[PDB]
Amino acid sequence: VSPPPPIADEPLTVNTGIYLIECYSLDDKAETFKVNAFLSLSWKDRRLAFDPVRSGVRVKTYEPEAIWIPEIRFVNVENARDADVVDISVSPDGTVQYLERFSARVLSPLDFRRYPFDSQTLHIYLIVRSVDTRNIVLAVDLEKVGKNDDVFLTGWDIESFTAVVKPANFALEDRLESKLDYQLRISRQYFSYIPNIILPMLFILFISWTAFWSTSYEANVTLVVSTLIAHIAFNILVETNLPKTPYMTYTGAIIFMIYLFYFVAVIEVTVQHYLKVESQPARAASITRASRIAFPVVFLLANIILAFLFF
Amino acid sequence: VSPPPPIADEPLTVNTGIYLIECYSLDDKAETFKVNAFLSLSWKDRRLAFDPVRSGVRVKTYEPEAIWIPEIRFVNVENARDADVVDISVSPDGTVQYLERFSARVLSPLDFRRYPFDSQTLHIYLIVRSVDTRNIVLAVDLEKVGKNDDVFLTGWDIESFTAVVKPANFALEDRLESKLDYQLRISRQYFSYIPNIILPMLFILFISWTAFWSTSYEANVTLVVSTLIAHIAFNILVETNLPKTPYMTYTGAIIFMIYLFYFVAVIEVTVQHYLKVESQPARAASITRASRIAFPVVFLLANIILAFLFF
Amino acid sequence: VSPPPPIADEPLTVNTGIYLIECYSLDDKAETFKVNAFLSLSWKDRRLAFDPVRSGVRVKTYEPEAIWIPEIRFVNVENARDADVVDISVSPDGTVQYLERFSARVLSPLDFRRYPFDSQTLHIYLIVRSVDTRNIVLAVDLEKVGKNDDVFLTGWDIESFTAVVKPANFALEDRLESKLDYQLRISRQYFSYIPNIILPMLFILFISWTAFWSTSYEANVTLVVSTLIAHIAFNILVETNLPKTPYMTYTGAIIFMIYLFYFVAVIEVTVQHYLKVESQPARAASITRASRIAFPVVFLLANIILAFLFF
Amino acid sequence: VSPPPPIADEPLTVNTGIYLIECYSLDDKAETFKVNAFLSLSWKDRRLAFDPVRSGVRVKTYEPEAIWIPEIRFVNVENARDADVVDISVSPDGTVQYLERFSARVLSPLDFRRYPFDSQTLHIYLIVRSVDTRNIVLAVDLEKVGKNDDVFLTGWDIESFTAVVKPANFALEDRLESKLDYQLRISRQYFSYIPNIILPMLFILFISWTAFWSTSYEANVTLVVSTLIAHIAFNILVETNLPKTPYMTYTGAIIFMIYLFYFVAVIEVTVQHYLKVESQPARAASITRASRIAFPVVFLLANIILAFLFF
Amino acid sequence: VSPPPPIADEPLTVNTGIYLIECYSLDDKAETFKVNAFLSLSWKDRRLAFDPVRSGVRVKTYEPEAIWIPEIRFVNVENARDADVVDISVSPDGTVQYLERFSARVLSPLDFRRYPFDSQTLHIYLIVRSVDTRNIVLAVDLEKVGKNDDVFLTGWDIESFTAVVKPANFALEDRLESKLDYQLRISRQYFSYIPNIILPMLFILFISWTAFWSTSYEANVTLVVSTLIAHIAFNILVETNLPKTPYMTYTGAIIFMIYLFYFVAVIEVTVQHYLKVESQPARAASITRASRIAFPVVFLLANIILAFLFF
Numbered sequence A, B, C, D, E: 001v002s003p004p005p006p007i008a009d010e011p012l013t014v015n016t017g018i019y020l021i022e023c024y025s026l027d028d029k030a031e032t033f034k035v036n037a038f039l040s041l042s043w044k045d046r047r048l049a050f051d052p053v054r055s056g057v058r059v060k061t062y063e064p065e066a067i068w069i070p071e072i073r074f075v076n077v078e079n080a081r082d083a084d085v086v087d088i089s090v091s092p093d094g095t096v097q098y099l100e101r102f103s104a105r106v107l108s109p110l111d112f113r114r115y116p117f118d119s120q121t122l123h124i125y126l127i128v129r130s131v132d133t134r135n136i137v138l139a140v141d142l143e144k145v146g147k148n149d150d151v152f153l154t155g156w157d158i159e160s161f162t163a164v165v166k167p168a169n170f171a172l173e174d175r176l177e178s179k180l181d182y183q184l185r186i187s188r189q190y191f192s193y194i195p196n197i198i199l200p201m202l203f204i205l206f207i208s209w210t211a212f213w214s215t216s217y218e219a220n221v222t223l224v225v226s227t228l229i230a231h232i233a234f235n236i237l238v239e240t241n242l243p244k245t246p247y248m249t250y251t252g253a254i255i256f257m258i259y260l261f262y263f264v265a266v267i268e269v270t271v272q273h274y275l276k277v278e279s280q281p282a283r284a285a286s287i288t289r290a291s292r293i294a295f296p297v298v299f300l301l302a303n304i305i306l307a308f309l310f311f
C-alpha cells in the first residue's frame, strides 16, 4: 500500500477501459443517466513481479487490500459509485489487471434546442490524482472499451461509445490530475412525439380555423377560446417533461407561436363581429375571406422559417 | 479462497436455482420489476471432502469466508443485489450447497404494441466470470427452480417461471463468461382499462355524434369541442402511464384515430352551417343524414381493421 | 455458533412475539405498509445453563455473536428488515430471551371491492428455516404480542393485532420451514370520501338534471356536457388513488354508472330538441316530463341494487 | 460494557438534553418532520472515577466501545436515527457526559381542524429500557435543551421547544421503560393561503352571482357551471395538500358549503327561466331580486357561523 | 488519537478549503441543493514531525485511523455527508494536509420576493467543536477554495464562491464552537418564464379585453369566464413550483392582481348588459368605450407600480 516507485522519474500510466452493461433512466429534467458497467485498470508495479518457473503459476491473484491500487474516481457523478471488485490478476513482469463492476448516476448536461429532434453527447469523466512520490496518468486501452448489444436506453437510440484517447492533465490544488473523456452518443426517438403532442396540437389549431367559415360570434368565440385552452394543456404537458432552459427550444417556439395565431384569430373574429353589428357584412366578409388563406399560409410559412433557424 | 482446481482440465459446473418469494412493482415507464427470491448454488470442491465415519457428521457447515464461493452476479439489475446468506452445507464428497435470499430491482424491457392486452416475458440473467485457473460454467437444477403460490404481481397474471437450461457462453474482455436466462412470463390484467379508460372514451365520442341530429351550430360546436377536450384528458392520462415507445401502441392508435373522427365531425358541423346560412338546408340535411350512419360505420369499420393489424 | 443439539430428536421450538410501536404509510396503490416493532424470541439452549449460587447472578447477558441465535426472517417484506438488538438474557436453565427492535416495509395485498367502505387484514409472516442437525419450529407467546395505544395508522381504524397460534410447516427446497401468521386488522375511515368525492359528484349530477326543466338545447348541451367533464375529473382523481384491480370496486361501479346517466340525458336532451324543430313540443314535453321523475327514480333505484350486490 | 451497579438499589438516572440544529420537511400528508439535533446524555458510573492529582487530568476521554452507554432510543421515528458520536468526557467522580449529533424522521400526528389557521404540538419521545441488573430512568437537564436561532421550519412559525420534566414510567414486556416527552410547538403561516386559495375561490363565487342581474339562461348557465368547475379545481388542489382526516377541516367545510351555494344558484337560475318561458317575468324578477341580497347575506351569515364552531 | 497538545495554551487552528466539483438539484420548494466537493483540512500536529535526511522521505503518508483528525462537521445538511478520504500527507514539521471528497444535501433558505427575477446566496457552514484539552478554531485557506469551470447548476447562473474569512466563535453546550461561512452566489435564469408563463398569461388576459368591443353578453361572459379559468391554471402551475412564503412574491402579486382585472371586467360586462336590457345602449356604450382604454392603461399603470415596490 504505497505507489510503485519510478525506475527513473517517469509518470505511472494507468490503462483504463469502460464496458457498459446497462444504460437507463435518462432523466431530461435532471440531466442525469444511470450506468452499470465494467471498469478495467492496468498498470505496472514491478515489486509484484515473479518467476513462472519457480512460482509455478503463469499468473497470480491478489485481494484489493493486498496491493496498491490507483485511486481512480468519476468526476461527474452524484455519489461515489458503488463498486464491486471482480478480479485482480498479476502477471510475472508485475503488470496488474484490475476489474470492477460499478454503477453510478452520471450528471452530464443536454442540449434541448432541437427537442424533440435532438441528439446528445453524454460524458463519463475518469480522473486520477497524482500522489506525492510520483505522477499518475490515465490512458485508454481501446481493446477494453465497449458496450454490449442489449444496452437499451429507453426512448433513445445509441450511436456510439468511445473515449478521447488524450487525457487532459492539469493542476488542481497542489497536485496534478489526469482526466479522461468517455463519450456516449445518443439521438432521441422522435416518433412518439408525433401522435402524442405535435399532431393533436395542430388538429385543435385547425379546428380553430373553421371560425373563418362562420359568421356566428357566439360560436367563433367558443371555438377559438375552447381550443386555446386545449393548447394551453399541451403547452403545460410539454414544459413539465423539460428542464427550464435559458435558450429557446424548437417545440417551445412552435408552441409559443401558436399562441399568436390564437390571439390574432380572436382579433379577426372580433373585428368581423364589430363590422356586422354596424351593418358592414361586406367589409367583414372580405377580411374573413382573406383569413381563410392568410392563416394557413402564414403558418406553413413561419414554421418553415423556424425549422430553418433551428436545423 | 481460491478456485477448486481440476482433476484434469474440465470446466467447473455451478448448478443454479431461483425460487421467487415475491414479485412486485412492475413499473411500465421504467420497465423494471423488483424481485425477492432464493438463489441456490451447487458445485464440487474436492478439497472439502471428508469421512462420515471418522468425522461423525453426515454433512458439515461453513461460513462464506471459510470456503471459496463462485462470484455469481445478475446481469440486468440496477444495483448489485442485496444478499443474505442463509446456509452453506458441504457433503462428504466435497459437494457444496449454497443458499442465499436476495432482493434486486431487475431491468427487463417490455413490448407495449398490444397494450393493454399485452403479455410480457421478464428476464433475470445469472452470469459468472471464469477465473485464471479454470473455466466456470452455469447450469440449471430444475428441482430448485420455482415460485410460491402467493407471488402476486399487482395488476398482472403470472403464467410461468422457467429457465433456459442451456447457458450462453462467450468471451467478455479476456475471460469467458457463462450466462443463464431465467424467464418470468406474465400477461396484463386488461379488465380495469375497460370501465376506466376505454368505455368513457367511447361514450364522450358518441355524445359528440348527437350533433348529427341537430341543426344548431352554436350547440354542435359546444358538443364537439367540449368532448374533444375530455378526450385530450384521457389521452394525456394514458400517455403518462406509459414509456415513450418508438412504435405505435394499440391504445395509442385507437386514441389517435378518434382525434380524426373529431376533426371530421367539426368539418361536417361547419359545412352544414355554411349551407344553412346560404339557404341550403336541403344539401346540409342530406349530408347530416349520411353522417348519422357513415361515422358509426366507418368507426366500427376502422377499429376492426386496427385490431386486425395488431392481433 | 451451531444449533443446540436435541437431548433426543425433538424439534427446537422458538417462541415469537411482535409488539407494534408504529404503523404508518399504508399505500393503497403499492399495497404496502411500514411497521416499527419489537420482535421477541425465546428458546432453550442447554449448553448455556449455569448455577445461580456459584455464578452468583440470577441471569446472564450475551452479545449476539457470542451465542447461536435462530435465523428468523420475514416472508413478505420489501427488503431484509433493519434490526437493532436490544437485549439477550439467558436464565440458569439455558432459556434465551432475545429482543430486537425492527422496522420493515411489509407487502400484504388489499381487497378494494367495497372501497372506500372496506376493511383489510394485514399480514406479517415470520418464517424460520430448519438446519441440517435439527428442525426448528415457531410458536406464539401471546403474552408478548401486542401494540401500544398510540399506534395510529393515518386514515384507518385499527381493530386488532393477533397471531394464528398454529404455524404452517412445510418443505421448501430440501429443508423444512416454519411460518407464523401475524394479523393486523383495520377498517378504512370512510368519512372524508363523503364531502370530498361522493357528494360533489352527486351535486354535479343533479345540476345536470335541471335540463329536464328546460327547453333550450343550446343550454342543456352546456349543462350536461360541462358537468360530464367535472365528473370525468372526479373519476380520474379517484383512479389515481387506487391500484388497477381486475375486479370492480364499489366507487368504481357508481362512478361508471353515472356515465350512463349522462349519456342517456344527452340522448333525451337531443330527442327533445329534434321534436321541437319538427314542431312537436307536445311529444317532447311528455318525454321531458317523465325524465324529471324517471332519472332520479332509476338512479336511487340502481344505487340500491349496487349496494346490495356489494354489501 | 455492563451497567454500573447500584451502591444500594437506586435506579440509575440518565440526564437527557436535546438541542435542535435543524427542523425541516414538515409533510402534512405523512404527518412527519425531519430533525437534526444534539442529543446529550449524562449519568454516574463510579467504576470510571479517578484522581485528578495522580492521573494529572481534570477529565478523561473514552471511545463509545470502551465504556457502558445507556441504550437510549426514540419512540416515534421512521427508522433508527443516524447518530454520530461527538464526545465522551468522564469527570473524576465517574460522571459521564455523552454527546451525539443525530438526524431522524419523526412521526407525530397533526390536528387539521383549524387548517390553515392551525397550530401543532410536535412530539419527540426519548425512551430507555431497564436492564436486568438495574432500573434506568430518564430526566431532563433543562440547561441542555434548546434550539438555535436559525432553525427555520419552512412555512411555519416556531413558538417553543421544551420537555415535560416528569418521565412516564411503565412496564413493557417484562422490563420497565422510561419515556420523555420533548415538545416542539408551531403555528402555521396562514398568509399565502389567502391570495393563493381563499380569495380566488371567493372571486369565482362572486363572479357566479352576477347571474342574478341577468335574464339570459343561455348565459347564466355558462357563468354558474363554468365557475363551479373552477371551484372543483381549487377543491382538488386543497385536498391533495392534506391527509384524509375523519373529521371536518375548516377549509373543507368552507369549500363544501360553497358547493351548496352553486347548486342553489343553479336552481334559482332554472326557476327564473321556467317562469320567463311560461310568461311570468314578474314572479321571476321578484325572486331574482331577492337572490341578489339573500345569497351574499346568507353566505356572510353562514361563514360567521362556521368560524364560530371552529374557533 | 488524541488532540495535539499546545506548546503553551494557543488554540489549534484548522485551515479549511472547499472546491466544488458539482452543484445540482436546487429544489425551490424544499430550499435545498446537492453539492459534490473537495474538503481540504490542514493543521500542525508536532508529534508527527520527522527528519527528511534520516527518514529519507520529504513527506509521509498516514491512514485516517493512524492519526488524530479534527471532527469537522457541516451545520446545515440533511444527513452527515458521505465522505471518502482521498489523501493524508504529513510534512516534516508535523503539518497535516487532509483531503476528502464529499457529497451532501445542503439546506439553505431562499428569498422568493423577486421571483423569477431573484438572486440567492447559498450557504455551506463548516463547524468544529472544541475538545476538553484545547480549543479548535477554523480558518480559510483561500488558495484551496474554488469551483471548476463546468459546475453547472441547471436553471441558474453561478456568480461566485467565496468564504467569509472570519469564523464565528461561540459557546454551544459547555464547549466552544468555530463556524465558517462558505457562500455560493447565484442568480436565476429568468428567460424560460417569459414564453412559458408570463406572456401566455398576458395573451389570455388581452383576449378577455375584446369583450369591450362587443355587445353580446352571451359571448362576453364566455370570453371572460373561459380565460379566467385558463388563468387559474397558470396560477396553480406557478404555485406548485414554489414553497409557501409568508411574504408576497412578484409573480404572485402580478398573478393575483390579474384576478381583479377579471372581476372588474365581469362587472363591466354585466353593467353593460343591464343597461341594454333597460334600453340604454347610450350609457352602456359610453362605459364600454372607456373600458377599452381604462383597462390597458390602469394595467400598464399598476404593473409599473408593482415593479417599483419590488425592485
Ligand SMILES: CCCCCCCCCCCCCCO[C@@H]1O[C@H](CO)[C@@H](O[C@H]2O[C@H](CO)[C@@H](O)[C@H](O)[C@H]2O)[C@H](O)[C@H]1O
Pocket (backbone or CB within 6 Å): A229, A230, A231, A233, B026, B027, B028, B029, B030, B229, B230, B232, B233, B234, B236, B237, B240, B241, C029, C236, C240, C241
Ligand atoms: C384539454 C384541456 C384539459 C386537458 C385535461 C388533461 C388532464 C391531465 C390529468 C392527468 C393526471 C394523471 C396524473 C398521474 O397519473 C398517474 O397517477 C398514479 C398515482 O400515484 C401514478 O402512480 C405511479 O407512480 C410512478 C410515477 O409517478 C409509477 O411509475 C408507478 O409505477 C406508479 O405507482 C402513475 O404513475 C401516474 O402516471
Ligand SMILES: CCCCCCCCCCCCCCO[C@@H]1O[C@H](CO)[C@@H](O[C@H]2O[C@H](CO)[C@@H](O)[C@H](O)[C@H]2O)[C@H](O)[C@H]1O
Pocket (backbone or CB within 6 Å): C229, C230, C231, C233, D026, D027, D028, D029, D030, D229, D232, D233, D234, D236, D237, D240, D241, E029, E236, E240, E241
Ligand atoms: C371539470 C374538470 C375539473 C378540473 C379541475 C382539476 C384541477 C386539479 C389540479 C391539481 C394540482 C395538482 C398538483 C398539486 O401541487 C403539488 O405538487 C407537488 C409536487 O410538485 C406535491 O408535493 C408534495 O408531495 C407529497 C405528496 O405526495 C407531500 O407530502 C410533500 O410534502 C409535497 O412536497 C404536492 O403534494 C401537490 O399538492
Ligand SMILES: CCCCCCCCCCCCCCO[C@@H]1O[C@H](CO)[C@@H](O[C@H]2O[C@H](CO)[C@@H](O)[C@H](O)[C@H]2O)[C@H](O)[C@H]1O
Pocket (backbone or CB within 6 Å): B229, B230, B233, C027, C028, C029, C229, C230, C232, C233, C234, C236, C237, C240, C241, D029, D236, D240, D241
Ligand atoms: C376537461 C378535462 C377533463 C378532466 C380534467 C382533469 C381531471 C384530473 C385531475 C386529477 C389531478 C390529480 C391530483 C393529484 O394526484 C394525487 O395527489 C396526492 C397528493 O400529492 C397523491 O398522494 C400520493 O403521493 C404518491 C403519488 O405518486 C403516492 O404513491 C402516495 O401513496 C400518496 O401519498 C395521490 O396518490 C395522487 O393520486
Ligand SMILES: CCCCCCCCCCCCCCO[C@@H]1O[C@H](CO)[C@@H](O[C@H]2O[C@H](CO)[C@@H](O)[C@H](O)[C@H]2O)[C@H](O)[C@H]1O
Pocket (backbone or CB within 6 Å): A026, A027, A028, A029, A030, A229, A232, A233, A234, A236, A237, A240, A241, B029, B236, B240, E229, E230, E231, E232, E233, E234
Ligand atoms: C383552462 C386552463 C388550462 C387547463 C388545462 C391545463 C392542464 C395541463 C395538464 C398537466 C398534465 C401533467 C401531468 C404530469 O405528467 C407527467 O407525470 C409523470 C408521472 O410520474 C412524470 O414521470 C416522470 O417524473 C419525473 C419528474 O420529476 C421524471 O424525471 C421521471 O423520469 C418520469 O418517470 C412526468 O415527468 C410528467 O411529465
Ligand SMILES: CCCCCCCCCCCCCCO[C@@H]1O[C@H](CO)[C@@H](O[C@H]2O[C@H](CO)[C@@H](O)[C@H](O)[C@H]2O)[C@H](O)[C@H]1O
Pocket (backbone or CB within 6 Å): A029, A236, A240, A241, D229, D230, D231, D233, E026, E027, E028, E029, E030, E229, E230, E232, E233, E234, E236, E237, E240, E241
Ligand atoms: C378550471 C379548472 C382549473 C384549470 C386547470 C387547473 C390547473 C392544472 C395544471 C396543474 C399541473 C401542474 C404540474 C405539476 O407537475 C410538475 O412536475 C414536474 C416534474 O414532472 C415538477 O418538477 C419538480 O418537482 C419537484 C417538486 O415540485 C421540484 O422541487 C423539483 O426540483 C423538480 O424536478 C414540477 O415542480 C411540478 O410542478
Ligand SMILES: CN[C@@]1(c2ccccc2Cl)CCCCC1=O
Pocket (backbone or CB within 6 Å): A021, A147, A148, A149, A150, B075, B125, B168, B170, B172, B179
Ligand atoms: C448482447 N450482450 C451480451 C452481453 C455482454 C456483457 C454482459 C452481458 C451480456 Cl447478455 C450478450 C451475450 C453475447 C455477449 C454480449 O455482447
Ligand SMILES: CN[C@@]1(c2ccccc2Cl)CCCCC1=O
Pocket (backbone or CB within 6 Å): B021, B147, B148, B149, B150, C075, C168, C170, C172, C179
Ligand atoms: C404459497 N407459498 C408458500 C410459501 C413458500 C415459500 C416461502 C413462503 C411461503 Cl408463505 C406458502 C406455504 C406453503 C408453501 C408455499 O408454497
Ligand SMILES: CN[C@@]1(c2ccccc2Cl)CCCCC1=O
Pocket (backbone or CB within 6 Å): C021, C147, C148, C149, C150, D075, D125, D168, D170, D172, D179
Ligand atoms: C400508549 N403507548 C405506550 C408506549 C408503549 C411502547 C412504546 C412507547 C409507548 Cl409511548 C405509552 C406509555 C404507556 C405504555 C404504552 O402502551
Ligand SMILES: CN[C@@]1(c2ccccc2Cl)CCCCC1=O
Pocket (backbone or CB within 6 Å): D021, D147, D148, D149, D150, E075, E168, E170, E172, E179
Ligand atoms: C443562531 N444559531 C447559532 C448556531 C447554533 C448551533 C449550531 C449552529 C449555529 Cl449557526 C448561530 C451562531 C450563534 C449560536 C447560535 O445560536
Ligand SMILES: CN[C@@]1(c2ccccc2Cl)CCCCC1=O
Pocket (backbone or CB within 6 Å): A075, A125, A127, A168, A170, A172, A179, E021, E147, E148, E149, E150
Ligand atoms: C473545468 N473543470 C476542470 C475540472 C476540475 C476538477 C475536477 C474535474 C474537472 Cl473536469 C476541467 C479540466 C481543467 C481543470 C478544471 O477546472
